[PDB]
Amino acid sequence: GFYIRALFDYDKTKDCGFLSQALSFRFGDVLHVIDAGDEEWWQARRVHSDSETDDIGFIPSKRRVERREWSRLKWGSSSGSQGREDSVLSYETVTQMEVHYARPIIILGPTKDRANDDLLSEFPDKFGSCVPHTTRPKREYEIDGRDYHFVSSREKMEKDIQAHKFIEAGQYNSHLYGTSVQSVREVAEQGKHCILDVSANAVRRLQAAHLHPIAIFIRPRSLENVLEINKRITEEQARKAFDRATKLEQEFTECFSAIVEGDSFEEIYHKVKRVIEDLSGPYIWVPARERL
């Protein structure tokens, strides 16, 4: 057969009370498909972190998932311009491969900064940050190659950016800053997980660089849940956080390695550590070339 990764949560029994041989699964689960000859239902079994064998069941095909989703909502204030392109996430084919580097880490969503700081502080021999580049002139107290890799020519960095040498870059106070593929690779090859403070946009570039990251989205269940996990912010900025999170999930779900939820930061932190443990390797699942 072959392997696919679920990009949505599925549980028919919980949803409508219908009992059947349909398998239930959650976002991120790797599924071993044994027979996908039928266009509507495929035979499969969930791949555990130990025992792949457990219960052969059936999962809805990509076709079936798409048909169901399109069947939902949609003149409603039509300006006459095209709307956002219809995109239905179902599954992604994947394959197992062995890696000899520590996977970089990208935590996203509310409290990601605290999670980053705590991992860096709690496990200094396992996690570290990479050295960023900047065109800003080096200050008296700064050290080239430690605080930043100071680039004398802004022209060169702009060229390097266009050449996609940075997984992420930007401008601040009229100067350029960026996290280079090479800086991340240096940390990764030394066997340390590189804690990255970048957007989900960086996942594709890291994948292209053969530095598959563990991208973890901390998903708030509601506005109130945000206040439960981050009780150091005003309810006003909590609204923003929740909306920013909703928009992040809408646009980058396919890039996430996992999604974690909790009633407290302590629960989230615990789950983050477990996800990293589960996906660190040596054997990991990456996108395959097979197409459904």
Curated annotation (Swiss-Prot):
Modified residues (Phosphoserine): S20, S51, S174, S222
Residues with PTM Phosphotyrosine: Y148, Y283
A biological process term (GO) from this entry: positive regulation of synaptic transmission
PTM comment, free text: Palmitoylated. Palmitoylation is required for targeting to postsynaptic density, plasma membrane and synapses. Palmitoylation by ZDHHC2 occurs when the synaptic activity decreases and induces DLG4 synaptic clustering. Palmitoylation by ZDHHC15 regulates trafficking to the postsynaptic density and function in synaptogenesis. Palmitoylation may play a role in glutamate receptor GRIA1 synapse clustering. Depalmitoylated by ABHD17A and ABHD17B and to a lesser extent by ABHD17C, ABHD12, ABHD13, LYPLA1 and LYPLA2. Ubiquitinated by MDM2 in response to NMDA receptor activation, leading to proteasome-mediated degradation of DLG4 which is required for AMPA receptor endocytosis.
Compartment(s) where it occurs, according to its Swiss-Prot or TrEMBL record: Cell membrane; Postsynaptic density; Synapse; Cytoplasm
Main localization of the protein described in the UniProt heading: membrane
UniProt tissue specificity: Expressed in brain (at protein level). Detected in juxtaparanodal zones in the central nervous system and at nerve terminal plexuses of basket cells in the cerebellum. Expressed in cerebrum. Expressed in hippocampal neurons (at protein level). Isoform 1 and isoform 2: highly expressed in cerebellum, cortex, hippocampus, and corpus striatum.
Domain spans labelled SH3: 1-69
Keyword annotations: Cell membrane, Cell projection, Cytoplasm, Lipoprotein, Membrane, Palmitate, Phosphoprotein, Repeat, SH3 domain, Synapse, Ubl conjugation
Domain Guanylate kinase-like, residue spans: 102-277
Keyword Cytoplasm: yes
GO molecular function, one term: D1 dopamine receptor binding
GO (cellular component) term, any one: glutamatergic synapse
Assembly and interaction partners: Interacts through its PDZ domains with ANO2 and NETO1. Interacts with KCNJ4. Interacts through its first two PDZ domains with GRIN2A, GRIN2B, GRIN2C and GRIN2D. Interacts with ERBB4. Interacts with KCNA1, KCNA2, KCNA3 and KCNA4. Interacts with LRRC4 and LRRC4B. Interacts with SYNGAP1. Interacts with ASIC3. Interacts with SEMA4C. Interacts with CXADR. Interacts with KCND2. Interacts (via first PDZ domain) with CRIPT. Interacts through its first PDZ domain with GRIK2 and KCNA4. Interacts through its second PDZ domain with the PDZ domain of NOS1 or the C-terminus of CAPON.
Function: Postsynaptic scaffolding protein that plays a critical role in synaptogenesis and synaptic plasticity by providing a platform for the postsynaptic clustering of crucial synaptic proteins. Interacts with the cytoplasmic tail of NMDA receptor subunits and shaker-type potassium channels. Required for synaptic plasticity associated with NMDA receptor signaling. Overexpression or depletion of DLG4 changes the ratio of excitatory to inhibitory synapses in hippocampal neurons. May reduce the amplitude of ASIC3 acid-evoked currents by retaining the channel intracellularly.
Note on domains (UniProt): The PDZ domain 3 mediates interaction with ADR1B.
Family statement: Belongs to the MAGUK family.
Protein name: Disks large homolog 4
Originating gene: Dlg4
